[PDB]
C-alpha cells in the first residue's frame, strides 16, 4: 500500500521516478488509504483478517489458486426479531 497517493502517480513514476526502487506488477486498486498493488478486489464481504483502512481488509484466500484478496468488511449477520 503506497499510503496517500492516487494510483495514477505510482504508475506514471514507476514508468520512471519513485524512491523504493524495488517494483511490483499485479492488480492496482484505489482505496481511500492509498494505492493497493498486488491484491484483487472481490465484491463479496467477510470478517476482518488484515486491516488496511477505510472499510477495506485483506486475506490469503484460495480461489487451488491461493492469492491475497481485498474486500469491504461485514459488521455481522442479519436478524429481524418477530415483534408484534
Amino acid at each position: 500500500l503506497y499510503q496517500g497517493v492516487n494510483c495514477t502517480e505510482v504508475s506514471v513514476a514507476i514508468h520512471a521516478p519513485t524512491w523504493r526502487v524495488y517494483s511490483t506488477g499485479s492488480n492496482v486498486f484505489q482505496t481511500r488509504a492509498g494505492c493497493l498493488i498486488g491484491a484483487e478486489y472481490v465484491n463479496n464481504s467477510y470478517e476482518c483478517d488484515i486491516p488496511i483502512g477505510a472499510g477495506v481488509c485483506a486475506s490469503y484466500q484460495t480461489q487451488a489458486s491461493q492469492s491475497i484478496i481485498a474486500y469491504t468488511m461485514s459488521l455481522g449477520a442479519e436478524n429481524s426479531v418477530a415483534y408484534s
Partner: protein, 429 residues
C-alpha cells in the same frame, strides 16, 4: 417524628451525555522533517542513534489503540437487528432516533444535526488559502480510521433496534421478543412502582416522552456549546501539529533556518556545527510532540472505557447505580453516534406533586404488632391505610398486606387501629 411526604404524580425526563471515544492517527518521517533533501544532514543524524526508530514505534501504538477504543464501544452486538416494517410501539415515537432511509447516509434526524455541527480538518481521504491540509508536508500524514462513519452508524442502529424489540435480553444471550408497552412495565417494577401505574396511565407516559425527545433537537442544537468536549479534541491536536511545523522556522542558534544556505555560505567544517545546532532543536521538538500525544492518548482511553461501561449497564440493562445514567431513577438509554464520540440519551422517572401525611412504625390490633409487608402506613387525618412508597395509592390495612411480629410494647410509636381479616368476615356467611 411522625410526618412523611409521598409523591402523587410523575414526570419523564430525557437527558444527554457526550463522551469523546477516539482521536487522530498521525505519522511522521523523522528525516524528511529534521533534514529534508540535504544528504549531509541525513548522514550527520546517523550518530544520534535510534532516537527516531523509537518515535515511530510510539506514534504507531497511539494509532492502533484509537481503533480499539472504537471497537470496544460500538462493536458489542452479535448480529445486526432490524426494526419491524410497521413502526407502532405502543404510542411511543422513536422517529428522531431511528434511521432515516430518505437521506443517503442512513443517519437519524439527530445524528445528522450532530455531524453538521462539529467542524474539523482530520483528512485521511486521498483528496488532499485552504485548510489545515497545509501541514500535509515536512513528513506529517493523517491516517484514516478503519470503521467508516456509516459503519459506526449501522452498529448504533442494531443497538437501538434490539432494545425497542427485545428489551435487555439481547445482551445476555438470544434476543427474545416482548410487546413494548410491557417492557416499560418491567422497568417500572425495577425502580419500585407497580405495573398497574403504567397500564392505567400509558397515553400520558407516552406523551410526556414523545414531548421530551422533541426538545433535545432544539436544546443540543440552538445552545451552541455542548459539543464542546468533542471539539476540543479536534482543536488541541491541530494546535500541536501547527507548532511543530512552525518550529522548523527557528534557528536554535545558527547562521539561519535553511540547512542549504549554511551549505552554500560556509565551508565543509563550519557547517558540521551550525547543522547540529538544527539537527538538535528539531529532534527535541519531535520528542516533545510525541510525549504530549502519549499523555492525551491516555485520557481518551479513560473516556472510551467509561463509554463502553455505560453502553453495557445503561443501554443493554437498567442500572441501580445513582447518577451513572442520568438524574432520576433510570428506565432506558439510547445511543447516538457523533464525530469522534458518542451521545447517550437517558430516560428517567422523576417523582412529582408530593402531599404530607402522618406515619406510624407499626399498628396494634389485638395485643399483636402488625408491620407493612411492602409499603408504608399513612393517615389522611382520620383513617389509616397502607400505600407503596414512591406513588400514593392508598389501601385498607388487612392481614394480607401486613405481617405480625410481637406484642404491642417494644415498638416506640405503635398506634391502635383495625386490621381487617378477609377469611373470618366471610366465615360469617
Amino acid at each position: 417524628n411522625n410526618s412523611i411526604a409521598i409523591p402523587t404524580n410523575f414526570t419523564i425526563s430525557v437527558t444527554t451525555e457526550i463522551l469523546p471515544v477516539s482521536m487522530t492517527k498521525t505519522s511522521v518521517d523523522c528525516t524528511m522533517y529534521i533534514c529534508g533533501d540535504s544528504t549531509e544532514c541525513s548522514n550527520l543524524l546517523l550518530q544520534y542513534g535510534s532516537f527516531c526508530t523509537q518515535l515511530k514505534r510510539a506514534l504507531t501504538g497511539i494509532a492502533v489503540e484509537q481503533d480499539k477504543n472504537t471497537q470496544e464501544v460500538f462493536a458489542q452486538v452479535k448480529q445486526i437487528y432490524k426494526t419491524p416494517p410497521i413502526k407502532y410501539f405502543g404510542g411511543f415515537n422513536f422517529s428522531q432516533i431511528l434511521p432515516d432511509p430518505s437521506k443517503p447516509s442512513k443517519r437519524s434526524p439527530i445524528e445528522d444535526l450532530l455531524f453538521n455541527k462539529v467542524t474539523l480538518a482530520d483528512a485521511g481521504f486521498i483528496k488532499q488559502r485552504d485548510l489545515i491540509c497545509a501541514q500535509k508536508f515536512n513528513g506529517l500524514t493523517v491516517l484514516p480510521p478503519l470503521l467508516t462513519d456509516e459503519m459506526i452508524a449501522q452498529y448504533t442502529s442494531a443497538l437501538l433496534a434490539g432494545t425497542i424489540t427485545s428489551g435487555w435480553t439481547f445482551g445476555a444471550g438470544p434476543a427474545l421478543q416482548i410487546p413494548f408497552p410491557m417492557q416499560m412495565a418491567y422497568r417500572f417494577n425495577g425502580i419500585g412502582v407497580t405495573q398497574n401505574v403504567l397500564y392505567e396511565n400509558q397515553k400520558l407516559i407516552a406523551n410526556q416522552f414523545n414531548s421530551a425527545i422533541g426538545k433535545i433537537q432544539d436544546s443540543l442544537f440552538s445552545t451552541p456549546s455542548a459539543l464542546g468536549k468533542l471539539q476540543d479534541v479536534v482543536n488541541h491536536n491541530a494546535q500541536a501539529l501547527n507548532t511543530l511545523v512552525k518550529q522548523l522556522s527557528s534557528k536554535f542558534g545558527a547562521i539561519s533556518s535553511v540547512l542549504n544556505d549554511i551549505l552554500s555560505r560556509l565551508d565543509p567544517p563550519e557547517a558540521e556545527v551550525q547543522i547540529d545546532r538544527l539537527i538538535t532543536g528539531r529532534l527535541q521538538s519531535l520528542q516533545t510532540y510525541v510525549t504530549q500525544q502519549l499523555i492525551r492518548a491516555a485520557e481518551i482511553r479513560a473516556s472510551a472505557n467509561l463509554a463502553a461501561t455505560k453502553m453495557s449497564e445503561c443501554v443493554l440493562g437498567q442500572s441501580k447505580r445513582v447518577d451513572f445514567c442520568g438524574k432520576g431513577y433510570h428506565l432506558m438509554s439510547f445511543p447516538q453516534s457523533a464525530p469522534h464520540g458518542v451521545v447517550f440519551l437517558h430516560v428517567t422517572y422523576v417523582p412529582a406533586q408530593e402531599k404530607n401525611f402522618t406515619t406510624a412504625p407499626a399498628i396494634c390490633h389485638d395485643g399483636k404488632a402488625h408491620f407493612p409487608r411492602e409499603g408504608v402506613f399513612v393517615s389522611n387525618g382520620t383513617h389509616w391505610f397502607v400505600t407503596q412508597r414512591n406513588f400514593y395509592e392508598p389501601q385498607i390495612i388487612t392481614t394480607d398486606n401486613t405481617f405480625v411480629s410481637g406484642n404491642c410494647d417494644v415498638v416506640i410509636g405503635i398506634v391502635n387501629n383495625t386490621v381487617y381479616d378477609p377469611l373470618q368476615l366471610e366465615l360469617d356467611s
